[PDB]
Each structure stands twice: as structure tokens, then as C-alpha cells.
Design a protein around this ligand. Sequence first.
Ligand SMILES: *C(=O)CCCCCCCCCCCCC
Lengths: 203, 40
Amino acid sequence: RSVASSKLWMLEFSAFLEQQQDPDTYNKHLFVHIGLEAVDIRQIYDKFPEKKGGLKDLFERGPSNAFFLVKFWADLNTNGSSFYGVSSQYESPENMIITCSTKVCSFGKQVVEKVETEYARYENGHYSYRIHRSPLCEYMINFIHKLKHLPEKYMMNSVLENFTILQVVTNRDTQETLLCIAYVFEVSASEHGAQHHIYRLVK
Amino acid sequence: DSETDLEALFNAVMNPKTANVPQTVPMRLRKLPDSFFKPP
Ligand SMILES: *C(=O)CCCCCCCCCCCCC
């Protein structure tokens, strides 16, 4: 359990493109997937929204054990019959109503936000939450299109330097930060496809 | 003043002569762990 505070653990996260070849045949490509060294949070504050409710405000309010930075190397090697989606799964000892707020940022400015409410399912003494095949927003689809249509790989990384995602998972009733994950991106150059490093964010 | 929109973002990299996006410290030049740029 890497991405885990005291109250919530993210077991699974992936962004994918699923293509329907025919009614019985589907090809799925994963862009990124999950399924701890410390980083000075001050080194990344500029890459994320500021002011009240922003990364700094959230981190200062705590708890500090809820804050993570994920570095993704994204696999972009993939080709009206397409679905761009994201799936994620969480476990908790507690039965909560949680809100998952995902912000896409460019040069630290919020460009789009997706907000999702999730209820618990009892599963083996604990509770599971699943965001199943959430449609990827058009901005993200468009961003991926533009990325792949850049001449050179070095250009993709130059664009990605200033593209981040902030995911904040909150107890809806109490507004306690259960998980806050900052996502940073490079393009995968590896023969093993998508990779990742997970860090604890510290003061 | 600089722009911060989708076309401007890619334009800045495709045609650097006409770039008008905020300027930043490259991640490689920041105080970050070595593993940050060495994938597994
Ligand atoms: C829009 O509805 C929500 C914003 C996107 C959700 C985050 C999914 C992570 C996307 C990673 C795709 C890989 C491209 C670098």
C-alpha cells in the first residue's frame, strides 16, 4: 500500500484507450497504470493551483501523510469506435461517502476539473470504492491527439513539463483530505512500456 | 503578457520563434531525487 493515508488506499489507477474492433473484439492500450522517497513539496508548488483549496493550502491543513507525488512515464505507442477512460479503486476500514476531484493544470493554472462522488461497498471487513471506466474529458483526448502529432519525442516531454494533474479525494461530509495525489509526466522510452515512481510529499 | 492555452502550449514547442507561454525552471534543474529521471 504505497498511495495510502490512514483512512484510504488507492489500489488501482489506470488511463486507457479501448478500441472496439468488432462487437466481440476489444483492444485496450494502457497509457499509465498503478496496480517511498520524499519530495520537497515547495519544489512543485508552481506546477499546481495556488490560493485557498490549492495544493499549498491543502498540504498545510493536513494530514501530511495523505500527500503523494506520482511520476508517470506514459506509453503513447497506440493507434468512432474508441473509448478513452480512467479506472481507479480504493479501500478503507471506514464506510464513507467520498468525493474525488481531478484537476488538469497547465503552467499551474486549472484548465478543467472532473468531480465524482463514490459510495462504499462492503468487502471482507473493509470497504471498497471503485471509479469504473470514467470517461476521459475531451481536453485530455485532444491533448493526447496533439502530443502524438508532434514531430519529435523531445517535444512531447517539453510540453509535458508544464502539464500536471491534481487528484484530491475527500470525505464529503467532513471535508477531510483522504488522499491528495500530484501527477507529473514524461513520455516512456522503455521497452517495458508505462512506468512510475511514487513519492511522499514533505514540507 | 503571455498566453497559457492549448494551441499556445504546442505552438511554443513546434515553432519556438513565436512562443509566448510562461517561462519556467526545467524539472531536471530542480532539487529532486535522482530516481525522478531514471525510470524502472
Ligand atoms: C477529465 O474528465 C478528467 C481529467 C483527466 C483524468 C486524469 C486521468 C490521467 C490521464 C493520463 C493520460 C496519459 C496522457 C499523458
